[PDB]
Design a protein around this ligand. Sequence first.
Ligand SMILES: Nc1nc2c(ncn2[C@@H]2O[C@H](COP(=O)(O)OP(=O)(O)O)[C@@H](O)[C@H]2O)c(=O)[nH]1
Ligand SMILES: [Mg+2]
Ligand code: NI
Ligand code: NI
Ligand code: NI
Lengths: 176, 135
Amino acid sequence: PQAIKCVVVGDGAVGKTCLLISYTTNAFPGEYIPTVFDNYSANVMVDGKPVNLGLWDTAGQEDYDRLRPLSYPQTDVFLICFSLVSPASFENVRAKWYPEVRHHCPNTPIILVGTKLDLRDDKDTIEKLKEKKLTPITYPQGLAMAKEIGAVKYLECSALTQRGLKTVFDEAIRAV
Amino acid sequence: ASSAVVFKQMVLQQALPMTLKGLDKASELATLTPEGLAREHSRLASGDGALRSLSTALAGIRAGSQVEESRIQAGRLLERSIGGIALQQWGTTGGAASQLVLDASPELRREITDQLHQVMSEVALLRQAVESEVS
Ligand SMILES: Nc1nc2c(ncn2[C@@H]2O[C@H](COP(=O)(O)OP(=O)(O)O)[C@@H](O)[C@H]2O)c(=O)[nH]1
Ligand SMILES: [Mg+2]
Ligand code: NI
Ligand code: NI
Ligand code: NI
C-alpha cells in the first residue's frame, strides 16, 4: 500500500476541516473544531490500488503563517481550497496560497478545490451576498484560476451533501 | 504513530506565541454593540474575524499550553454558554450561532454582546498566564 501525504490549505472558514472529516468519517462534523494543526488518515482504494492517505489540516489565519510550513515536508499533493460563496477567499488563491505552496514546494502537484458547492444554489446565501454586491464564484472562473496557477485539476465539492467529495481525493491520489 | 502525537504536540507548543496574536485580533469584541453583532457576525466568524480568531487561539492554548491551569481556563472559556451556545461555536458560520443571531431579538443580542464583553475580561487573565509561559 502506497502512502500518500496530502496537505490542505486555504483561508480560515472555507471548509477545509469539514471537507476532510466528511471524507474520512463519511459524516459532516457535528460541531466546529478550530484548527491550529491536525492530521487524519484513510485507507482507500483508487483504480484497484490500496492507498494509505495521510491528510494534513492547517490553520488559514495569517497569525499561523509561521506554523503552516511545518506541515509541508515530503508532501505528495496539495489541495488549495476556497469557498465558492466567498469571492475574497478565491482571490487569495492567487494572492497567497499558490505563492506560498510554490515557494516551499515548487514541484508538487496542486488540486484547486472549490468548497461549499451546495451553497451556490442556496437562496438565502445568494441573497446575503447580493446585499454586499457579491455573487458566487462560477465553475468557469474556478477552471480559469486552476489553469492560471498550473493546477492539475479543478474540482468542486460539498462536504455537507458529499457531492463531488470522493472525486477530490481520487484525483489527488491519481495526481501522484 | 505514537510519535505522530509527539510531533503534533511539538507543533502545538510552537503555536503558543501565535495564539497571542490571534487574541489581539479578538479585541474588538470588547466594544461590540448588539447592532454590530447582527450585522457583522458572518465577518467576525470567518477568516481571521474576531470571533473565529478567538476560538482558534483558545483552542491552540487549550491544546498547546504546558500549564494545566491555562489549558483548563481556555477550555472553560470555549465551553462558556453565550446565548445558550458555546463560545467555541460562535466563531463559525453555517451553524447554530449563525441561525440564532439571525433570529435574535434586541434583548438576546444585548445579552450575547454583554457576555462577549465579559469573556474579554477573562481573556486578559489567560493572556497574562500565556505571555508568562512564552517568556
Ligand atoms: N453549507 C455548507 N457549509 C459548509 C460546508 N463545509 C463547511 N461548511 C461550513 O463552514 C464552516 C467552516 O468550515 P471549517 O471546515 O471549520 O473551515 P476551515 O477548517 O477553517 O477551512 C463550518 O462551521 C460549516 O458550517 C459545506 O460543504 N456546505
Ligand atoms: Mg479547520
Ligand atoms: Ni512521495
Ligand atoms: Ni522563504
Ligand atoms: Ni459591556
